[PDB]
């Protein structure tokens, strides 16, 4: 019960947007157009999910934002909940870098804050 290439997890679906890269807001764009937003990532289940649909080799923008000294924030939002997070070992660590990716280092996949102009692929998410 979700449209052609995108991938059920319970009440959603979910696009890997792999065929070009792009900056946040130009990532958050073209997930509005197909009626959906950057993923709003609530619990391990829906990480790792998500992880293993991805390409080792690429990193993906998510739908969270540092709103302001280290504010995290989502763009949908709903509460950002301290006890689900997946933050790489160090991460985040830098107040510039104020968008999220999910990539995979030696230790596994997790998060890393980066710059929003930075051009990477995209997890987008709709309720079904
Ligand atoms: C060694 O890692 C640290 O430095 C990286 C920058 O490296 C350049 O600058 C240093 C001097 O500061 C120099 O020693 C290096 O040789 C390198 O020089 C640059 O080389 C490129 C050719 O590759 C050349 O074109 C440049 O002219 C030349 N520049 C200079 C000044 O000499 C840094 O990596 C950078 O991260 C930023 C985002 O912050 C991104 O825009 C850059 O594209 C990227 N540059 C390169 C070369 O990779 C490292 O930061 C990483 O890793 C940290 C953890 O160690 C993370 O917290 C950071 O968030 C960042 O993560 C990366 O973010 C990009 C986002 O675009 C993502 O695609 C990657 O997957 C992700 N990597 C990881 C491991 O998570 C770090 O400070
Ligand atoms: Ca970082």
């Given at each position: 019960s979700c449209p052609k290439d995108w991938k059920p997890?319970?009440?959603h679906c979910y696009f890997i947007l792999n065929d070009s890269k792009a900056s946040?807001?130009?990532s958050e764009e073209k997930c509005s157009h197909m009626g959906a937003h950057l993923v709003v990532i609530h619990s391990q289940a829906?990480?790792?999910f998500i992880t293993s649909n991805l390409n080792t080799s690429a990193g993906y923008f998510?739908?969270?934002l540092d709103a302001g000294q280290r504010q995290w924030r989502w763009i949908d939002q709903t509460?950002?909940?301290k006890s689900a997070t997946f933050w790489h070992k160090?991460?985040?660590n830098q107040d510039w870098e104020r968008?999220?990716?999910i990539?995979?280092?030696?230790?596994?996949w997790g998060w890393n804050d980066i710059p929003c102009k930075d051009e990477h692929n995209s997890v987008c998410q709709v309720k079904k």
């Amino acid at each position: 019960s979700c449209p052609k290439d995108w991938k059920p997890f319970v009440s959603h679906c979910y696009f890997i947007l792999n065929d070009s890269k792009a900056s946040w807001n130009e990532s958050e764009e073209k997930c509005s157009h197909m009626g959906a937003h950057l993923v709003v990532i609530h619990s391990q289940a829906e990480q790792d999910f998500i992880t293993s649909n991805l390409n080792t080799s690429a990193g993906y923008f998510i739908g969270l934002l540092d709103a302001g000294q280290r504010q995290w924030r989502w763009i949908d939002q709903t509460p950002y909940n301290k006890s689900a997070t997946f933050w790489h070992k160090g991460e985040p660590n830098q107040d510039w870098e104020r968008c999220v990716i999910i990539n995979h280092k030696t230790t596994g996949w997790g998060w890393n804050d980066i710059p929003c102009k930075d051009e990477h692929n995209s997890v987008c998410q709709v309720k079904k």
